[PDB]
A paper describes a structure:
PfEMP1s are adhesive proteins containing multiple discrete extracellular domains, falling mostly into two families, the cysteine-rich interdomain region and the Duffy binding-like (DBL) domains. While several DBL domains from different PfEMP1 proteins bind to CSA, VAR2CSA is the primary CSA receptor in placental malaria. The binding of VAR2CSA on the surface of infected erythrocytes to CSPG in the placenta plays a major part in malaria during pregnancy, and an understanding of this interaction will be valuable in the development of therapeutics to target this form of the disease. In this study, we present the structure of the DBL6ɛ domain of VAR2CSA and characterisation of the CSPG-binding sites of the DBL3X and DBL6ɛ domains.
Using a bacterial expression system, we expressed the DBL6ɛ domain of VAR2CSA (residues 2333–2634) from the 3D7 strain of Plasmodium falciparum. We expressed both the DBL6ɛ domain and the C2480S mutant and were able to crystallise C2480S. The structure was determined using multiple-wavelength dispersion data from a selenomethionine derivative and was refined to 3.0 Å resolution. DBL6ɛ shares a similar basic fold with other DBL domains containing a “boomerang”-shaped α-helical core that aligns to the core of the DBL3X structure with a root-mean-square deviation of 1.6 Å. DBL6ɛ is shorter (302 residues compared with 359 for DBL3X) due to more compact loop structures and a shorter subdomain 1. DBL6ɛ also contains fewer disulfide bonds than other DBL domain structures, lacking three of the bonds that stabilise the first two subdomains of DBL3X. While all other current DBL domain structures contain a disulfide bond linking the second helix of subdomain 2 to the linker that connects subdomains 2 and 3, this is not present in DBL6ɛ, showing that this bond is not essential for the DBL domain fold. Indeed, the features proposed to form the CSPG-binding site of DBL3X, the sulfate-binding loop and the positively charged surface, are absent in DBL6ɛ, agreeing with a recent prediction based on molecular modeling. However, no clear additional density due to ligand could be observed after structure determination.
Author numbering: 2350 to 2539, 2547 to 2633
The structure:
């Protein structure tokens, strides 16, 4: 559930990069034992990568359960991450990316061999994940398939995807918790009954994510905004990239780092006093 800093080179060029729970939970481990089983037998390695993609879709249903949109959206992230794992771009520490490099006949810090392997399997890896989705929900709907298109995340910088995911998940939870804060109190001018419990939860949440964002935005500004993120600002870029569910970052936190007061980010002026009593 937490956004850990278990990333590669986090003291160096990856300072402030946070690792998504979804990615931490993406099981894809190669042991140094099976380094030869996969090298001499190219299609055995394939069946393992395909089934790792399979199991990932099976894991996602266990988490989100009957939330079709919430599972499909994560598939596209996990799919892309497998690409990063394969290509060597991945940022997690014990990702066994070193072992994959040797298996695909590249090794010693190269890219060409393992880059072409991904390029040749992207389609079939995704096709597996589609069969995994079908095994999870029964029948693939005739109008559901538009969501389940072959996704374009593979070439996009990983941190940018990870940050986008953070922001989406942040805005979804922030909105969810701000909704419970209204269905707990409408007027309570002052101590009343249950309202403050939600106020503590919303405030706590904003303050957990405050630190996380400060860490993620530290990396963004240093590297990715400077070269090519369309030179847009941190909250400004996600405002036009991932639809309207990353706008809450700009809509409530752009003008100033007003994270310092979590109650100031409330559009309704009525409920603001019950939490700030």
């Amino acid at each position: 559930d937490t956004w850990t800093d278990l990333v590669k080179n986090s003291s160096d060029i990856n300072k402030g990069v946070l690792l998504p729970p979804r990615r931490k939970n993406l099981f894809l481990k190669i042991d140094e034992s099976d380094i030869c089983k996969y090298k001499r037998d190219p299609k055995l390695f394939k069946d393992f990568i395909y089934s790792s993609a399979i199991s990932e879709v099976e894991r996602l249903k266990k988490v989100y359960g009957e939330a079709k949109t919430k599972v499909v959206h994560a598939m596209k992230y996990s799919f892309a991450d497998i690409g990063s794992i394969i290509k060597g771009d991945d940022m997690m520490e014990n990702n066994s990316s070193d072992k994959i490099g040797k298996i695909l006949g590249d090794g010693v810090g190269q890219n060409e061999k393992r880059k072409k392997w991904w390029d040749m399997n992207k389609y079939h890896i995704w096709e597996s994940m589609l069969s995994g989705y079908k095994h999870a929900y029964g029948n693939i709907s005739e109008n559901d398939r538009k969501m389940l298109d072959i996704p374009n995340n593979d070439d996009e910088h990983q941190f940018l995807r990870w940050f986008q995911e953070w922001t989406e998940n942040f805005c979804t939870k922030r909105n969810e918790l701000y909704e419970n804060m209204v269905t707990a109190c409408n007027s309570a001018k002052c101590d009343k009954k249950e309202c403050t419990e939600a106020c503590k939860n919303y405030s706590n949440f904003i303050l957990i994510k405050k630190k996380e964002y400060q860490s993620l935005n530290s990396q963004y500004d240093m590297n990715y905004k400077e070269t090519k993120a369309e030179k847009k600002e941190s909250p400004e870029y996600f405002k036009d990239k991932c639809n309207g569910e990353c706008s809450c970052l700009s809509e409530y936190f752009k003008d100033e780092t007003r994270w310092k007061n979590p109650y100031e980010t409330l559009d309704d002026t009525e409920v603001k006093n019950n939490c700030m009593c």
